[model samples]
Target chain A: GRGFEKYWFCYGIKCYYFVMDRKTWSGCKQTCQISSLSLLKIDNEDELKFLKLLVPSDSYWIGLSYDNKKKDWAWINNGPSKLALNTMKYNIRDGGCMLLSKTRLDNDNCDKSFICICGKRLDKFPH
Target chain B: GRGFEKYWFCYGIKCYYFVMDRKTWSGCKQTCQISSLSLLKIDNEDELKFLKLLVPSDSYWIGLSYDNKKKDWAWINNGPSKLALNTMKYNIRDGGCMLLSKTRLDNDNCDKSFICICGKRLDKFPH
Candidate 1:
């Protein structure tokens, strides 16, 4: 019974969205780790479509943004290659990290502070 | 006083960092809700800088990504206007949820599991 089912709800497409209370940037990450997944990483359009249908349309946080380097934006998860680019409106000014705004497309500094979204794979959780 | 002191640590410039245990995506969102503030929304450079310093430089999640429409990217927070654009590096393929990768700048599908980050106003918690 040690499966993500206790923490997550499967929404098909090999994706499972967690249902927990809101947390801080650090807290959210920790949650993902504890659940056995890193965070949520959007790979392609199909996945994006899945997320939209899975979660509420309201603004939520993902794991991507500019780095302290100022020039390079990256995901806190930091995987392998650069998948998406400049999806957010503003550039990385200081915080470097990216945030999904209420309007979407608007990429602001991480300091702005907003809610966050976390996810894992259905496999990670037990049925 | 009903402020964010107990829940957050103010880092100045109207930014506050929170410290909590890891929670699922929904859990994190609920936590923010109980805190009386929305999720974390990064705005500009200074804010990003504050975030880098405020939290660990790991691949944490943010609140932004494409919609189910697959045409437009939006933030879960849903604020005023579009600030950053395509900062994640990848296009919304399917999941529509944008996640920060361990490498950064790589926008993948949310179906891809990873960690997350959340934030709110310091004023939301009380000291």
Candidate 2:
């Protein structure tokens, strides 16, 4: 393992890779793809609460983004987010992407750079 | 991995195992020994801060405890802890053991039960 490959951690049924290096949302999505993981998708409320406590102070790019075709926010898995988007003020016309903050989820442009979070099932191995 | 062996995570130069099962301090120490790791030691301030954020909201047995032979608190490796002891109130005569809390390091009776944190260098692997 090298570069963004080394910082992996496991919790419950999933293992997450936290990439400290900054990159655009698309770049981070590609990184997870190459590593056999997907950009983070919150599986449940418990998982979201756990991640809020686990992640470092800085913002991170998760798998949520606005789909122009669907005209709504969707996870990389092509499903509606378990997280409520009503609380966040985001304009879909601005090319929206989701970022994980210590206290809440924030919306930003996909071109903005931030740390990355990649995730996969615990039963799966990246190798 | 099985039993208390499944929850492994990596950060910086070390990897950690978080055991949610309750056990005495000695029991936790033995578990780490059997797993080819050591009870978690706070390597540096940054690592300690990272752990404070990463751990769940429960006390965990760490590697620091009072050594009767040495007549002072010492880490399992026989060195003074990087953590300052002045702020914590502990009775060494009552049999002291260290626990990691979200806000501070706590001193507790070695016979008391709690979760476990085991650690090893990233360069080493149990397999």
Candidate 3:
């Protein structure tokens, strides 16, 4: 088998597992980290578009959050998000985290429970 | 930025490039080999299903072809195809190559030119 179960869907070189269990932002991160995966990160324009196509109407936690100290949005890797700021809903405030929905990326309270998307690169298989 | 361009669509850990330029079976293999890719192979059931959904009505070359010595079908890697034999159109004969379409897998002359699909794993990126 390809190292992933049926629940984890793959596109391109990465595989994503949509965690249906509702969890807070921290809980979602912890769950993915323990499994050697990470909260999903949108690496490029196409990635965002691809994800939007697959994501359901309900909000899902992504790897982005507002960094209180830096007062900037950052991905789980601590790198600043490259997405255009205008695309956001402008609801960001202290202790905010990003949520992915069908139409937009929104900022919401990190403590709120929601479904999350976990992802990791595919295993390197040699020919 | 993760190595592939917009033309290549990825699903799971693999990215596929559908070459619209018509080419014979050997030509298609050459193109992918030059890029360190291989002619597309149906590794498993899910992969086959995914490709079927994406493929258009027109025929496209896959990596399978008849091996005269073995009197059997083999993928580009020289490994035998695992796809259920019944799913094929059964027109298989000497010098036959596999062509993928919207609904069925058909055997065609290897010398015929057709659009081809090439594939490779995603590059390993350090976090």
Find the candidate with the highest lDDT and give its number: 2
lDDT (tens digit, per residue) of candidate 3 on A20-43 = 578899999888777777888877
Clashes of 2: 0
Q: After superposition, how far is residue B15 of candidate 1 from its true place, in Å?
A: 40
Say which candidate scores most in DockQ. Answer: 2
Query: Model 3 Cα displacement at B81 (Å)?
Result: 2.7
lDDT (10s digit) by residue, model 1, range A37-115: 6556666654564455434335545676556564565666565533556435454454544444333434544444344
Which regions of candidate 2 deviate over 4 angstroms? A1-7, A31-37, A77-95, A102-106, A120-127, B1-8, B31-37, B44-46, B77-91, B122-127
The predicted structure with the larger lDDT, 1 or 3, is 3
lDDT of 3 by residue, B1-127 (tens): 0222334456667767766478899988887777677788887777788777654447878888877797767787775445766624466654488878868778888899988788776773434
Off by over 4 Å in 1: A1-13, A100-105, A109-115, A122-127, B1-127
Quality class of the docking in candidate 1, CAPRI style: incorrect
Give DockQ for candidates 1 onward, in order: 0.02, 0.47, 0.06
TM-score per prediction, in order, is: 0.38, 0.71, 0.55
Q: Is candidate 1 or candidate 3 better by TM-score?
A: 3
Cα RMSD for candidates in order: 21.7, 4.5, 7.6
What lDDT score is found at residue A15 in candidate 2?
86
* C-alpha positional error of residue A33 in candidate 3 after TM-score superposition, expressed in Å: 2.3
Q: What overall lDDT goes with each candidate model?
A: 0.49, 0.79, 0.72
